[PDB]
Design a protein around this ligand. Structure first.
Ligand code: ICS
Ligand code: CLF
Ligand code: CLF
Ligand SMILES: [Ca+2]
Ligand SMILES: [Ca+2]
Lengths: 477, 522, 522, 477
C-alpha cells in the first residue's frame, strides 16, 4: 500500500467516531517516515485513553506489581486492596525463576489484604500491620515485602509509608510501600516509573556504606529483562561466555540481594528502556555507572549488541566476543537456512506494550519478513523516536490502538501474521489470520539471544504455515 | 546451544549442563540464597499440623484466594444479552484483566469497554467519562444495549450511576430510549458471583419495573430460567436441551453460549445470540422463574418475587441424580408437561453408569473448592457416588450456605468425615491436604500448585488435581464440558472414575514391583 | 495383616514387609530364577535395533496381536438388528469369549447363543445341533430373527449352513418364514471386521435377493448407511444426528446403539431398538448406499452394487475435517438437501478449536494402531492437526489399503517420517517405540503394556498411551465417546491436546528443578 | 420359599422349553436336601449343554490354557490355531505373578501361531517348528514352552506331539503338547484333566532321578490355587507362619522349577479339587504323597483348615497353628464387628465354575449372610456331593444354568446379592440387584485367608449397601 492509500485507510476508519474521539485518535495514527527523527512532529503518545473505545491498556498496578516488582523472587508482594487485581494478575506473566515456591520464593502466589467494606470505611493500615506479622510467621524465609497499592488505598487516604517504616524498623526488614494505584497515570507506564522510584528510595541504597563485595572490571547488570520464558537466562549465558560477570537481572529471576549489589557494577545493560530507563539514569547520577541500550532479538541485533557491549571493556572481552559470535554462527545460520525460505516475503503487524513493537523487527527481517504495521499500548515519544528508523517507509504506526481500529487496519492490510496480546489473539484467529502472542510468547520461548532465535523461528513458522489456516472456508461456500 | 532439527524451548533447554552451571553460579554469586537444608526444614514445617494451626489463625493475610471481584461477574452476565456491550465505569486496568481472565478460560474474544476514569475524576467524579464513553461505545461498536457496572475507584469516590446515565440521555450523548441498565458492583463486597446477581437484577429492573401494570403471571406460558455465573457452555446447552425435549416453553435470561463459541470461518463476530430485549420485557408474563444457582441469586430472587410476583421454587442447582430429578419434577408441575421417555432413559443410563463404576468410587476421599452452588452440587453428587467429600472449601461462602451443606453431609453416612470451610483460601486448603490427605482434589487450575507442593514432600503424599470449575487455564476446551443435569453427572462420573484408574495405573506401572496389579481389565 | 479402618487390596497389601520377605523366600528357594543382572541385560537387548531386526524377521510367531476372529464381528453386526439373537454355529467356548470381550468393553449385557457342537459332530456334522439349537433359541429367548455365523470347528468340518437351516425349516424345527440369515465366518480368514462384512452381506442377501423384481432405485427417497464394525456409541449417534439435522431420510443398517446402552431401571431388556426387517426389505428402494468403513465392507459393496444397483460413492470414513466435509457434500448431492447452518457452525467451531490448540499439537509424534478405516481416518486427522503419525500399524491391514495410506502421507509435509505396517503386531510396535521413540501411542488397552515396558527403560523413554480404539478395558465409559464427524474430531483434538499438556505438567512438576516451566496458563 | 414353592418355580420356568430341552434341564435343577450324600440321586452334571439355550460355559482350551497352564509364569504358552482364542483370553484372568514380563515371565502376553487358510489346508506342524525357533531367539530366558491346541489342530490331523519331541530334543527344552481343543469334553472341566495329564507326562517326572533337593519334614505344596488377585500369596503366608515350607504353588505365580520339585514334598494341599484332583491322585499313586482338601475362605474355614493341616505334622506345627490363629483373631473379629451388622440376614445366590459355588458359603455365613441358591457351570457329581451338606435345606441348586433360568430364578427369589461372572453381571445390575464378580473378584481381592476376608467383607458391603441401588426407580414412576 502507498502512503496516500494508508492515509486514506486512517481517514475511512476514523469516520465512525464522534468528533471529540475522531480528533483525538487522528493524532495517534501516522504513516512512518524514517527520515523523521522528532516523532512529536508525526504522532502523539502517553495521553489518556478515550472512554468507551476498548483500549488494550492496563494500569499502573500492572506496571508496578505485574511487571517490575512481581518477578523479584525472594520477596513477598502484597496486592493491597480488594481481591480482584491480585487474582487476575496471579501467574499471568511468564517471569521465570528458580526457587522453592511458598518457601524461599513467592512469584506465582497471590498475597492480598482482600479489602472488605470495613477496610474501605475505616482504613486498611491496621490490617496491613497485622498482615505483615502473619507473613513473617508463615513465610519466615522471605527476604523482604512490597506493598502494591490498588485503586482504593490512595482514595481512602491510608498511610502505607508509615506502616512500612514502623513495621520495617520493628522486624529489621525491608518493607517497600508502592503507590501504584491504578487511577494514577494513563497506563502501565506510570507504574514502571513509580516502581523504579520505590526501588530507588527503599532498596537500592542499602549497601552504600558496604565495601565487602568483591567487584571486578567486568561486572554488569541486565536491566529491564523480565525473563519471559527464560529470556534473561538465554541473554546472561552469552554475556558470561563473552567474559562478563552478570551481577544482577532486573527483575526476571531477580533476588533482592542482586538489586542491592547493582550499584557495585561497571556497566548497566538496558534491554527494556521504557520500564527501567528511570533507575538507569539514577544509577549514573548517583554511582557514576554508565548504561547502554541493547537488543538481543535475532542474530543481527544480538551480534551488534555483543560487539557494542564488548567495546566498553578491554581486548580480552572483545576477543571472547568474536569467540562467542563464531561459536553460534553455525547454529543461527542453520535456523535461517531452514526457516527463512518458509517465511520469506511474509508481512507482519505488531501491537505490544512499550519495547517489543520495535525491538523484534530485526528478528523478523532475519527471516525475511516485513513488519508493515507496529504500535504500542503505552510507549512515549522517545520510543517512537527509536521506532521510525527501524520501520520501513509508508508503514503504519498506531499508539493506544482501539479494538475497532486494529480490526479495520487488519481487514484492509491483510497481514500474513499478527503478533499481539491475549485480548487480540482469538479475534484474528477467527478472521483466518495466523497469530502469535508477543507478550507471553504463546507459552513458548525464550526468544532472546541465539538459543531464543531458533525457538522464535520455529514458532513463527509452525503458526504462519499451519494446515488449519487453509480450512476456514467450508467447501460448500 | 540448539540443534536445528530438535529445537528446545525453556523446558528442556535450561536443563543443559551450560545453563545448569550458569544458574548455579548466579545463585552462589549474587542471590544470597538460604541454604538448601534450611529450605527443606521450612518446607517440611509448612506440611505440619503445627503450621496448619497458625495458618488457620490468619485474620488479615489472604494467600491464593479462590474468588474474584464483583465486576467480573457483571461482565459475564452482560455478555449473555443480545448485542450487548459490557461497560465497566471506572478504571481501565480492571477491564484489561477481566477480558484476559475470560479470554484464557474460554479461548475466545471477550468484548468489554471501560470509560477510563483517571486520577482527575476524584475532584468531579466520572460524569464526563460516562457521557463520552456511552457516546463513543454506541457509535464505535454499535451494540443494541450497554450494560453498566463499576470498578472500585468509582464505588469509593461515590459516582451515582443512575444520575450519570440519566444526564447522558438528558444532554443527548445517547438516545433517551437506548437501553442502559446499570448496577453498582463494589469489588470489596462479596465476589464475582455477587457482581452477576447485581448486574442481572439491574437488567431485570431496567426492563420491567415501570411497565408492570399490564403483566399477568402465566400469560406467556413460559418458565424463566436464570443460570447465574456459569463458565461451562455445556451447562447452558443441557438446560435448553432438556426443556425442549420436555416441550416446555422457556426463556433463558442471560445466555452467552453463542458469543462464547463463535465459529472460526473468516470473520470476527463481536456479538452472537443471547437473551433478547423482548424476552426480558415479557419475562413477568412467565408462569414462574427458576434460579439454577440460588446461593448467588438472592437479590434477583427478592426482585422476581417482590415485583414479578413469581413463586420461585426452592430448588437446588440441578447437579447429580436427586437434584436433577427434583428440577425436572418441579418444571413438570409448573409447566404441566410430563417428563418424556427420552429424559427417563437418560436418567437410567446415568444410574447404569453408577452401578458400573461404584466399586472404584466407593470411599474415595476428595478435597474440593469453587463457588457455593457448584460446590454443594459437587458434594451432593459425590455422596450419591459413595465418595467422601472430606475438605469442602468455599472462599466466597456464607454461614447460611455452610449450615445447608452441613445438613446435606449429616444426611449421608458418606458425610461423616467432611468439614466445610468458608472464608478460607487455597493456602488453607494446602495445609488440609498435607495433614488429612485426601485421594484427589477437585478444583480449578490454581490447584496445580498444591499438587506440585504435595509431590515435593513425596510421591506417596501427592494429591492429583481433577480440573472442574473456573478458571481452567492449563487445559484446552474443558469449558465445553457439562456439569448440570444427567449429562453433566455422566461427565463428572466419567472424569472421576477414570482419574482414579489413571492414578492406579501409575502406581502399578513398576516392572516386577507393583505391576502384579497392572490389570488389563478394570 | 490388615487394619480394619484402612483395608489394603492386593495393591498395596503385598508391599507389606512380611509379604515382600515371603516372596523373596519363594523366589530364592524354589523358582530357580535368572539373576537380576541377566534379566536387566536381556531387557536392555529387547529395546535395541539389533533385537528389532530379529523381531521384524518373524514369519511363524505372532505376539500380542491387534485383531480378533471373524465371528466376533458377525455377532456385533447381528446385535444391530431389531429383536435379533446372534447365533454362532459350532463350539460354545467361542461364544463365552465373544460375550465376555464385548461385556468388558461396553459394560453391558451381550446376548449370543451357541449350538454347542462337540467332538461327536466330526462324524456327520452339526445338522442336529442346528435343528434343536434354532428351535431352542426361538422358544426360549423369543427373537424375531436369528442371525447365524460359524466358529472354526464348523468351518473345518465343512457344515453347509444353508442346507442345515433349510432342513431345519423342512423338518418343522422353526417356521418356514422365520428369518434365519447366515454367513460363513472362518476365524482363519482376515479378522473380526471381515466377519462383520460377511454377516451383513448375509442379512442383506436374505431380505432382498429374491424380491428384487418390484424394487426401484430412489423410490423411498432415503440413503442407506452401513456403519461396519463400530464400538463407539457416539459414532452411531452422530451420524443419525447429522443426517437428521440435514433433513435427510436415511436407514441405518445394523444399529446396536440402543441394545448396548439400555437404562438400569429395574428390568433387563435383552433386545432394544435396532434396524427393522421392514428397513432391510425396503433398502434396495433407497437413492444409494453409503459405507462408513469401506475397507472392511468390500463384500457388502459388491452385493449392494451388483444386486441393488446402487452407485456406492467413493467416500473415506468421515473422520477429521476434510473427510467429514466430503461425506456431507456427497450426502447433500444424493439427497438434494443443503448442508444446514447448524453443521456449518459446528464445522467452524472445530476449526476454531484447531486454531486454539495447534501450537501444542504441532510436530507431535504418534505411534498408533487399530482397524484399517479407523487408522487411516486418525492418520488423516493427525496430518490436519500438523502432527506426525510416525508408526502406523494395522495388523489386519492389506496391501491395497497400505498403498492408499502411503498416498495420504505423501500429500502432506507431516507424512514425511511415517511408515505404515501391515501384518505386524504390538510386539513389533514395542520395538518401534524404543528404536524410534514417538511422543505418544494412540491405541487400545493392550498398549498399556508397551507403556509399562518403555517406563522400565527410564522415565525419559516412557511413551504414554492415549486410549482410542477397541478394546478399552481399563477405563470406564469411553465406549460412549465419538470419533466420527466434527463432534468426533473435537473429541479427539481435545483428548490429544490435553494428553500433551498433562504429560508436560508431569515433566515440569519438580520443585526447583523443572517447575520454572509449570505454567498456570497454557 | 418352601420346598413346594421352589419345585413349582422349577416347573414354571421349564414350561417355555421344547420337550427335549425341558426333559433334560429338569435333571440339572434340584431342591437341596442336606441329608442326601449321593447327589446322583438328586441332580445330573457334566453332560453336554443343550443347543441354543445360552450356557455360561467355556471350552477345554479355557480350562487348560486359561486356567491350568496360562499362569505358569516362566514358560511361554502358545495358543496354537487361529487368532481368536488367544486374544479373548489374553489377561482376562487375574492369575497374579512376580516377574519381568516379556523377559523372564510371559503370563499376560499372547503368543499365537495365528493360523491362516494355508495352515488349515496343509497343516500347522511346519509353522509350529518355525514358531519354536522364533520364540527361542526373541525370548531366550523362557524356561519352557507349552502348545495349547485350539479347535482346528486335531480336526486337521496335526501332530504337535512329534513337533514337541523333535524340537524339545533339538533345543534340550521342555516343550509340552496339550490337546485341549475346544471340541473336546463339554466345558472347561475336560481341559483341566487334559492339562493335568500333560503336566504328568512331560514335566512332573523330570527330577525323578535327582537327589540334590534338600527336603524337610514340613514341605508342602499348594495345589489348585491360581492366585486370583494374590489369593495364593495370602494363603501361603499363613502356611509358612504355621512353620510349613511351601515348595510349590500350582499354578498361580508358579514356576516350572517349583512344579518339578513338587514330587519332593510331604503333603499336597488341594484348594481347587475339581481342577487338580487328577494330578493329586497321580502323585499319591506314584510318589506316595498324601493329599487333602482345604478351604481358606473366611475365618471359620481357614481356622478349621489350618488345624486340619497342622494335625498331619507334629506338636511343633500344631503349636504354631494356635499362634497363627491367636495372631489373626483380633483382625478378623474386627472385620466381623464392622461388617456383619451391615450384612446380617442378607440373601445371596451364586453361580460360578467348579469350586467357589460351595467353597465361599462359609465366608458369607461369617458375615451372617444366607446362600439361598448356588450352582456350577461344569462341576461333577462329586462336587455336588460336597455341596449338599454346605447348603441349607430347600435351597436351589442349578447345574449348567441357562441365561433364561438364571434370570427367572432371580426374579422370583429376589436375592439381596448375586455372585457370578462377567456375562451375568450387567444383567442383574439393570434389575437393581447388587452384583459381585466371584471369578475376577471385581478387580479386587485377594479373598483367601485372613487378609482376604477383610477385603471380601469390605467388598460385599460396598456393593450390597451402595447408594446407587436406591435410585433405579425414577421418582415420577
Ligand atoms: Fe513492558 S514495555 Fe509489558 S519488554 Fe516487558 S508485560 Fe515490554 S515483559 Mo506485556 S510483553 Fe518492557 C512488556 Fe512485557 S512490550 Fe510488553 S506489555 S517491561
Ligand atoms: S485499575 Fe481490582 S480488578 Fe478493579 S474493581 Fe478493583 S479489585 Fe476488581 Fe488496576 S488497581 Fe486494580 S486493576 Fe483495576 S482495581 Fe485498579
Ligand atoms: S472353542 Fe475352540 S478352542 Fe475354545 S475358544 Fe472356541 S475356537 Fe477356541 Fe472360536 S474364538 Fe475364534 S472361532 Fe476359532 S479362533 Fe477361537
Ligand atoms: Ca476459541
Ligand atoms: Ca453398563
Amino acid at each position: 500500500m502507498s502512503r496516500e492509500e494508508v492515509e486514506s485507510l486512517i481517514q475511512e476508519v476514523l469516520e465512525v467516531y464522534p468528533e471529540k474521539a475522531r480528533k483525538d485518535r487522528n493524532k495517534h495514527l501516522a504513516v512512518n517516515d524514517p527520515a523523521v527523527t522528532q516523532s512529536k512532529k508525526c504522532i502523539i503518545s502517553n495521553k489518556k485513553s478515550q472512554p468507551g473505545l476498548m483500549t488494550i491498556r492496563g494500569c499502573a498496578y500492572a506496571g508496578s506489581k505485574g511487571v517490575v516488582w512481581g518477578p523479584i523472587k525472594d520477596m513477598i508482594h502484597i496486592s493491597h486492596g480488594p481481591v480482584g487485581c491480585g487474582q487476575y494478575s496471579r501467574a499471568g506473566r511468564r517471569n521465570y525463576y528458580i526457587g522453592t515456591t511458598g518457601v524461599n520464593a513467592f512469584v506465582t502466589m497471590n498475597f492480598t489484604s482482600d479489602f472488605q467494606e470495613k477496610d474501605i470505611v475505616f482504613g486498611g493500615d491496621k490490617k496491613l500491620a497485622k498482615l505483615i506479622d502473619e507473613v513473617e510467621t508463615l513465610f519466615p524465609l522471605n527476604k523482604g515485602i512490597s506493598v502494591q497499592s490498588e485503586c482504593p488505598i490512595g482514595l481512602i487516604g491510608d498511610d502505607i509509608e508509615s506502616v512500612s517504616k514502623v513495621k520495617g524498623a520493628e522486624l529489621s526488614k525491608t518493607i517497600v510501600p508502592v503507590r501504584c494505584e491504578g487511577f494514577r497515570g494513563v497506563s502501565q507506564s506510570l507504574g514502571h516509573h513509580i516502581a523504579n522510584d520505590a526501588v530507588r528510595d527503599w532498596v537500592l541504597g542499602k549497601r552504600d556504606e558496604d565495601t565487602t563485595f568483591a567487584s571486578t572490571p567486568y561486572d554488569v547488570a541486565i536491566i529491564g529483562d523480565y525473563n519471559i520464558g527464560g529470556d534473561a537466562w538465554s541473554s546472561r549465558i552469552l554475556l558470561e561466555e563473552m567474559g562478563l560477570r552478570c551481577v544482577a537481572q532486573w527483575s526476571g529471576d531477580g533476588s533482592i540481594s542482586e538489586i542491592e549489589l547493582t550499584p557495585k557494577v561497571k556497566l548497566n545493560l538496558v534491554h527494556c528502556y521504557r520500564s527501567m530507563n528511570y533507575i538507569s539514569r539514577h544509577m549514573e547520577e548517583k554511582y557514576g555507572i554508565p548504561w547502554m541500550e541493547y537488543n538481543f532479538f535475532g542474530p543481527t541485533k544480538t551480534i551488534e549488541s555483543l560487539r557494542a557491549i564488548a567495546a566498553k571493556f578491554d581486548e580480552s572481552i572483545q576477543k571472547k566476543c568474536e569467540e562467542v559470535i563464531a561459536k553460534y554462527k553455525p547454529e543461527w545460520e542453520a535456523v535461517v537456512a531452514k526457516y527463512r525460505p518458509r517465511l520469506e516475503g511474509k508481512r507482519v503487524m505488531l501491537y505490544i506494550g512499550g519495547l517489543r513493537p520495535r525491538h523484534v523487527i530485526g528478528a523478523y527481517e532475519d527471516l525475511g519478513m516485513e513488519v508493515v504495521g507496529t504500535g504500542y499500548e503505552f510507549a512515549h515519544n522517545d520510543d517512537y523516536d527509536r521506532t521510525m528508523k527501524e520501520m520501513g517507509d509508508s508503514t503504519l504506526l498506531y499508539d493506544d490502538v482501539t479494538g475497532y481500529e486494529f480490526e479495520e487496519f487488519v481487514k484492509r492490510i491483510k497481514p500474513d501474521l499478527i503478533g499481539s496480546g491475549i485480548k487480540e489473539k482469538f479475534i484474528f484467529q477467527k478472521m483466518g489470520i495466523p497469530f502469535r502472542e508477543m507478550h507471553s510468547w504463546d507459552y513458548s520461548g525464550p526468544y532472546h539471544g541465539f538459543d531464543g532465535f531458533a525457538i522464535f523461528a520455529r514458532d513463527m513458522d509452525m503458526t504462519l504455515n499451519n494446515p488449519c489456516w487453509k480450512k476456514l472456508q467450508a467447501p460448500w461456500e | 546451544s540448539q540443534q536445528v532439527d530438535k529445537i528446545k524451548a525453556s523446558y528442556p533447554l535450561f536443563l543443559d549442563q551450560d545453563y545448569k552451571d550458569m544458574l548455579a553460579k548466579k545463585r552462589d554469586g549474587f542471590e544470597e540464597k538460604y541454604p538448601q537444608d534450611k529450605i527443606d526444614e521450612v518446607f517440611q514445617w509448612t506440611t505440619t499440623k503445627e503450621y496448619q494451626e497458625l495458618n488457620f489463625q490468619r485474620e488479615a493475610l489472604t494467600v491464593n484466594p479462590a474468588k474474584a471481584c464483583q465486576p467480573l461477574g457483571a461482565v459475564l452476565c452482560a455478555l449473555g444479552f443480545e448485542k450487548t456491550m459490557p461497560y465497566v465505569h471506572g478504571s481501565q486496568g480492571c477491564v484489561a484483566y477481566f477480558r484476559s481472565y475470560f479470554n484464557r478460560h474460554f479461548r475466545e474474544p471477550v468484548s468489554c469497554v471501560s470509560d477510563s476514569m483517571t486520577e482527575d475524576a476524584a475532584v468531579f467524579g466520572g460524569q464526563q467519562n460516562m457521557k463520552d464513553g456511552l457516546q463513543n461505545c454506541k457509535a464505535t461498536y454499535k451494540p443494541d444495549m450497554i450494560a453498566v457496572s463499576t470498578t472500585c475507584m468509582a464505588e469509593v469516590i461515590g459516582d451515582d450511576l443512575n444520575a450519570f446515565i440519566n444526564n447522558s440521555k438528558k444532554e443527548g450523548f445517547i438516545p433517551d430510549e437506548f437501553p442502559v441498565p446499570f448496577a453498582h458492583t463494589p469489588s470489596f463486597v462479596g465476589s464475582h458471583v455477587t457482581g452477576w446477581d447485581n448486574m442481572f437484577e439491574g437488567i431485570a429492573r431496567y426492563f420491567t419495573l415501570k411497565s408492570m401494570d399490564d403483566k399477568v403471571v402465566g400469560s406467556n406460558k413460559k418458565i424463566n430460567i436464570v443460570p447465574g455465573f456459569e463458565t461451562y457452555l455445556g451447562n447452558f446447552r443441557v438446560i435448553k436441551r432438556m426443556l425442549s425435549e420436555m416441550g416446555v416453553g422457556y426463556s433463558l435470561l442471560s445466555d452467552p453460549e453463542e458469543v462464547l463459541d463463535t465459529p472460526a470461518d473468516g470473520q470476527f463476530r463481536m456479538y452472537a445470540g443471547g437473551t433478547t430485549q423482548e424476552e426480558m420485557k415479557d419475562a413477568p408474563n412467565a408462569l414462574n422463574t427458576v434460579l439454577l444457582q440460588p446461593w448467588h441469586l438472592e437479590k434477583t430472587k427478592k426482585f422476581v418475587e417482590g415485583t414479578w410476583k413469581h413463586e420461585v421454587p426452592k430448588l437446588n442447582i440441578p447437579m447429580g441424580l436427586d437434584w436433577t430429578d427434583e428440577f425436572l419434577m418441579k418444571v413438570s408441575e409448573i409447566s404441566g408437561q410430563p417428563i418424556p421417555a427420552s429424559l427417563t432413559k437418560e436418567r437410567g443410563r446415568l444410574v447404569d453408569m453408577m452401578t458400573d463404576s461404584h466399586t472404584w468410587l466407593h470411599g474415595k476421599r476428595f478435597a474440593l473448592w469453587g463457588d457455593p452452588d457448584f460446590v454443594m452440587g459437587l458434594v451432593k453428587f459425590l455422596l450419591e457416588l459413595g465418595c467422601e467429600p472430606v475438605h469442602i472449601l468455599c472462599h466466597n461462602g456464607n454461614k447460611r450456605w455452610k449450615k445447608a451443606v452441613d445438613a446435606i453431609l449429616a444426611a449421608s453416612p458418606y458425610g461423616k468425615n467432611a468439614t466445610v470451610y468458608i472464608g478460607k483460601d487455597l493456602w488453607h486448603l494446602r495445609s488440609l491436604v498435607f495433614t488429612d490427605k485426601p485421594d484427589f482434589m477437585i478444583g480449578n487450575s490454581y490447584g496445580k500448585f498444591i499438587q506440585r507442593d504435595t509431590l515435593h514432600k513425596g510421591k506417596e503424599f501427592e494429591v492429583p488435581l481433577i480440573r472442574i470449575g473456573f478458571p481452567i487455564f492449563d487445559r484446552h476446551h474443558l469449558h465445553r464440558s457439562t456439569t448440570l443435569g444427567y449429562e453433566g453427572a455422566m461427565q463428572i462420573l466419567t472424569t472421576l472414575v477414570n482419574s482414579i484408574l489413571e492414578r492406579l495405573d501409575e502406581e502399578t506401572r513398576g516392572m516386577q514391583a507393583t505391576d502384579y496389579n497392572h490389570d488389563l481389565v478394570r
